[PDB]
């Protein structure tokens, strides 16, 4: 579909990702993906982090959120690290973050935080080579309220890979987010997108 020499603002990665969804439309896969994501978001919104790990997250997961340095659209010489990892977590590292959330001496969690997640624009396609691997794209608005008058709203597109694991349950094996805001105005990014 996309020629990136003509569509000059489109990255090679973005053009690759779109081809994956335009071709095969599978209406029931879109519906399975919607259910999966709605249930994940429900668990996260009620802060059932252990349940999220147990039911939504695969043992081989890579959970990654990057922040890309601002560079010239015309930049061709400067070749140093383009991005940093806000998150780049394996299952054990996610478990550490979950323990931190549940610890009774996490003072920042009292009074209890309030999360509301809005998941939209779900697209789903099976991978062409690994027929057990489901590609899911979705957008999230995440609202976090705490301590009377603190309100932070996060906005992101998520590129996921999900795979059937134990009990035949589809679990997240990769999440990739390129966070759109370079300087965060939300105090921190301490939320599971």
């Amino acid at each position: 579909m996309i020629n990136i020499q003509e569509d000059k603002l489109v990255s090679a990665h973005d053009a690759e990702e779109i081809l994956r969804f335009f071709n095969c439309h599978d209406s029931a896969l879109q519906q399975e993906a919607t259910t999966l994501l709605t249930q994940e978001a429900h668990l996260l919104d009620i802060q059932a982090y252990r349940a999220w790990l147990e039911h939504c997250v695969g043992s081989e997961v890579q959970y990654q959120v990057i922040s890309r340095e601002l560079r010239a659209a015309s930049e061709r010489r400067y070749k140093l690290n383009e991005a940093m990892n806000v998150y780049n977590e394996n299952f054990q590292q996610l478990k550490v973050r979950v323990e931190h959330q549940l610890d009774p001496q996490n003072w920042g969690n009292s009074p209890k935080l309030r999360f509301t997640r809005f998941i939209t624009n779900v697209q789903a396609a099976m991978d062409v080579n690994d027929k057990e691997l489901l590609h899911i794209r979705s957008n999230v608005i995440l609202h976090r309220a705490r301590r009377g008058n603190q309100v932070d709203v996060f906005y992101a597109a998520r590129e996921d890979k999900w795979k059937r694991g134990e009990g035949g349950v589809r679990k997240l094996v990769q999440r990739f987010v390129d966070y759109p805001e370079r300087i965060l105005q939300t105090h921190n990014l301490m939320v599971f997108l």
């Binding site: 010239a72 973050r97 610890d103």
Partner: protein, 447 residues
């Protein structure tokens, strides 16, 4: 407020008026007496290694372009066009021989010179004195083992002298380890705190770690995990605190080379640092080789902080009295294997970055302490920093600076605030020096 007479910091740095974290008139005054006067962190050689490489950085509220010159030197300029004042460069890093303004197209070199003006001949004739229209240049730019600092004030002490007694503690890691690199790009996050709140916290606050970070200590399983929830006080001689004439200061926690890093990196780090320490024993001596692989929590006055070994490197960029833009880089030893550097860089961001679970523990502490400084009944109240006062020494045979020979105290707060008060009440560097002629005596009183 009359800054000449107002006692914002009491004698010996023992207390500070809470308003210093909230007062906007004082913030404006700091732009002049703190940020326009002192050395500020810009970048690292590793981020601009080749001719034409540049980054943007903040110096106080100003933005500057920091550019590697053809001759290998670094010059820095206000990121503001000399014509009608538009911001020249809108990116964070790149490589170029010059910068062209998008308003009317004036073209400046990497050296700051006005090189071209559209239709100069037809419009200005020979009238335009381009020689006088170069970008406003940062007066002083100096390197501390690859780490580049800038200062707007031509009268400032050389950077090495400015670091004072703190330099001795940094050298094992910064110089004798073979050198450090900064891994970019930085995380960037805005917090609702005064720049001095995280600055003071990193310069001298070991006391808070066990309580504030109880959950992170318990969860992360780092070499300091036993401190969790103030379950245990560190051993006698577990470390020390120091401070210096120009305000820079640090805590030293002996042997804590893996720092905040979670159990997954502890064995590899403890092996690496220990092996280097064994080689350094012969070159710099046992004490200094041990300092190399000890965890230093340091602030380079005014607003640059770091945790060596953990590899956290921070800039607390001031925005207003209750707003700060936090920049977070990772520091790694150049001779570490590349896979270790990558993992160390991720672990720094994992703990202290935009989603840093440790850094998040500190958010409420810093933000509410700063915001309480605006509240009427708190403005004239005294923040306390008297822990360990009357037990500090100066001119010790082994450890230089004003030194508290205990891991936990407020020695470094006192020196930071002593320097802060001397600057805010002074008009120039000469007056700061006069105000600081008995700095160490002021800090060791009752000792």
């Amino acid at each position: 407020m009359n800054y000449n007479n107002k006692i914002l910091v009491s004698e010996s740095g023992l207390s500070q008026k809470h308003l210093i974290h909230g007062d906007e008139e004082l913030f404006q005054h700091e732009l002049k007496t703190i940020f326009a006067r002192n050395w500020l962190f810009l970048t690292h050689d590793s981020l601009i290694p080749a001719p034409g490489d540049y980054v943007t950085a903040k110096m106080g509220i100003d933005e500057v372009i920091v550019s590697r010159q053809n001759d290998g030197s670094i010059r820095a300029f206000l990121n503001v066009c000399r014509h009608r004042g538009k911001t020249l460069v809108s990116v964070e890093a790149g490589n170029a021989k010059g910068f062209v303004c998008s308003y009317h197209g004036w073209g400046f070199g990497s050296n700051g010179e006005l090189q071209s003006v559209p239709f100069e001949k037809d419009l200005y004739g020979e009238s335009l004195n381009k020689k006088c229209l170069g970008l406003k240049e940062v007066a002083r730019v100096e390197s501390f083992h690859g780490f580049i600092y800038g200062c707007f004030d031509q009268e400032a002490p050389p950077l090495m002298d400015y670091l004072g007694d703190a330099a001795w503690y940094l050298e094992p890691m910064f110089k004798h380890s073979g050198g450090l690199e900064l891994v970019g790009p930085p995380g960037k996050v805005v917090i609702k705190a005064n720049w001095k709140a995280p600055a003071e916290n990193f310069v001298g606050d070991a006391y808070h770690v066990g309580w504030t970070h109880a959950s992170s200590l318990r969860s992360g399983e780092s070499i300091f995990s036993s401190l969790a929830g103030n379950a245990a006080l560190p051993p006698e001689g577990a470390g020390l605190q120091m401070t210096s004439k120009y305000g820079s200061g640090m805590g030293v926690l002996w042997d804590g080379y893996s720092g905040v890093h979670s159990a997954d990196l502890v064995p590899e780090l403890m092996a690496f640092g220990g092996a280097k320490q064994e080689r350094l024993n012969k070159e710099i001596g046992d004490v200094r080789a041990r300092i190399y692989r000890s965890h230093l929590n340091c602030t380079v006055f005014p607003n640059n902080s770091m945790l060596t070994c953990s590899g956290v490197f921070k800039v607390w960029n001031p925005i207003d009295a209750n707003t700060t833009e936090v920049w977070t880089y990772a520091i790694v030893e150049k001779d570490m294997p590349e896979d270790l550097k990558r993992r160390l860089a991720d672990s720094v961001q994992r703990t202290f970055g935009p989603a840093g679970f440790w850094e998040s523990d500190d958010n409420d502490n810093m933000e509410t302490a700063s915001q309480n400084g605006k509240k009427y009944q708190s403005r004239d109240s005294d923040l306390l920093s008297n822990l360990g006062f009357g037990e500090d020494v100066y001119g010790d045979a082994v450890y230089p600076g004003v030194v508290g020979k205990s891991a936990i105290g407020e020695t470094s707060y006192r020196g930071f605030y002593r320097a802060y008060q001397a600057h805010v009440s002074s008009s120039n560097w000469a007056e700061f020096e006069h105000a600081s002629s008995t700095w160490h005596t002021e800090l060791t009183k009752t000792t």
